[PDB]
């Protein structure tokens, strides 16, 4: 662009950073609604443990439960955090192990 | 032609067709038999298949052995083979009754699908042929956009002779479109699956050939004032007067384009045209592409 064109337009317009699953918040608290399995996109082949939760904001989201084995059930309380599950499409939330009803993986 | 080798999709096609348990199914152009296998595994009481190619008959016969007493194979043309008495007469139902226990499903080439449905549409008007059992439903494959026209509504760019002819005789529903990549040889167009159920009361109650002529003359020029197309039904000497009378009696604005002619509009035209054909029987035989050939001093 010419200097006259740069002057008339000024600095480049920067669209604001889009909010993610946590809505620009470190963590959210949600109530478990259902516990189900999600199938990772091929080439990945597994039965990943996830749960649907109603977050404090009022929306409903799917959250991956990390660790080998969880005791979560409906009506339980959990603290979810950010971080996408790469193989699971649409799963942008994860459960925090060791907070509220969710407990640390049981080393056996 | 295009073949379907995916057993998952044939099972999906049967699943889309609904419950075939205890139903007398007539399959057209079974070919390799992928659809035939799915129909046989749907608790079908009796299945009759007509394959014109003798090369595929041995494959069908082998499938018949795998399903003893469930498969019937005829080496013939679907366009000519008569199924009026293929199934017992006790399953026949009245035209106003619920659809009989007869359902015609099949994946045919598009060369065969278009002539087959046109002949069957006349049979629906005649209530004969495959429709002697009543308002038999047909789940047939067509070219993606031919199916769009079979279901296209008034004013649609796909609205044409397929829309008026098919819809006035049947309730036409486009189920889904199958991708072409899985077909051998590969077609460059997708394949639309259409479900057709004959109507208890046809939208137009005139001879099938009369409706076909009126629909054809109307849609010969899609972008013209319909008055242009309807004029070709009448000899030039009486074209101006008769065309004005026809539109005046049918209560249609002469400037309405063929695409904006609804099913009820054609019914009014067909009803008026029927009276005119009774007044002059020679009018029904007029062809504008032949009178003009024979007008130039035929002698």
């Amino acid at each position: 662009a010419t200097l006259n064109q740069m002057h008339r337009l000024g600095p480049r317009k920067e669209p604001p950073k889009r909010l993610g699953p946590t809505e620009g918040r470190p963590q959210l608290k949600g109530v478990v609604l259902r516990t189900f399995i999600r199938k990772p996109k091929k080439p990945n082949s597994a039965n990943r443990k996830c749960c649907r939760v109603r977050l404090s904001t009022g929306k409903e989201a799917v959250c991956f439960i990390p660790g080998e084995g969880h005791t979560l059930q409906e009506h339980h309380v959990v603290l979810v955090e950010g971080g996408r599950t790469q193989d699971l499409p649409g799963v942008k939330l994860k459960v925090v192990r060791g907070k509220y009803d969710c407990g640390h993986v049981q080393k056996k | 032609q295009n073949f379907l080798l995916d057993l998952r999709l044939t099972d999906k096609i049967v699943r889309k067709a609904g419950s075939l348990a205890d139903v007398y199914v007539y399959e057209v152009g079974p070919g390799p038999g992928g659809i035939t296998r799915s129909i046989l595994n749907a608790n079908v009481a009796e299945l009759l298949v007509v394959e014109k190619d003798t090369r595929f008959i041995p494959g069908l016969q082998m499938l018949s052995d795998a399903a003893p007493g469930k498969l019937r194979i005829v080496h013939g043309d679907v366009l000519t083979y008569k199924i009026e008495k293929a199934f017992p007469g006790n399953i026949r139902r009245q035209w106003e009754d619920d659809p009989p226990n007869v359902h015609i499903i099949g994946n045919l080439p598009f060369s065969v699908s278009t002539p087959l449905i046109i002949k069957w549409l006349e049979n629906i008007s005649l209530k004969d042929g495959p429709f002697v059992y009543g308002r038999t439903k047909m789940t047939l494959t067509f070219q993606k956009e031919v199916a769009e026209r079979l279901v296209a509504t008034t004013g649609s760019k796909q609205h044409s002779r397929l829309s008026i002819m098919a819809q006035y005789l049947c309730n036409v529903e486009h189920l889904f479109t199958i991708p072409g990549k899985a077909f051998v040889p590969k077609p460059k167009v997708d394949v639309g699956v259409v479900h057709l159920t004959p109507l208890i009361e046809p939208k137009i109650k005139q001879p099938f050939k009369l409706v076909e002529k009126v629909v054809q003359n109307a849609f010969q020029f899609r972008r013209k004032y319909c008055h242009r197309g309807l004029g070709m039904l009448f000899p030039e000497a009486q074209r101006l007067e008769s065309t004005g009378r026809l539109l005046q009696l049918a209560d249609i604005d002469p400037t309405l384009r063929p695409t904006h002619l609804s099913l009820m509009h054609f019914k009014s035209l067909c009803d008026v045209y029927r009276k005119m054909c009774d007044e002059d029987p020679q009018l029904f035989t007029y062809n504008f592409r032949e009178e003009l050939k024979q007008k130039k001093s035929k002698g």
């Binding site: - | 509504t153 008034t154 004013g155």
Partner: protein
């Protein structure tokens, strides 16, 4: 679905006319007139006038 599009087009244009008419009523009412200017009739500009 062209039929619906024409139906949507004719109903969209009708709302487009009402918005035009209402915007003209706001102007004279705000100015303090209690009736539209004498010999004025809002032109119908979105109808099949051509």
């Amino acid at each position: 679905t062209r039929f619906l599009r024409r139906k949507v087009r004719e109903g969209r244009l009708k709302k487009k006319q009402i918005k035009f008419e209402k915007d003209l009523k706001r102007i004279w009412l705000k100015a303090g007139l209690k009736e539209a200017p004498e010999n004025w009739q809002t032109p119908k500009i979105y109808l099949k006038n051509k």
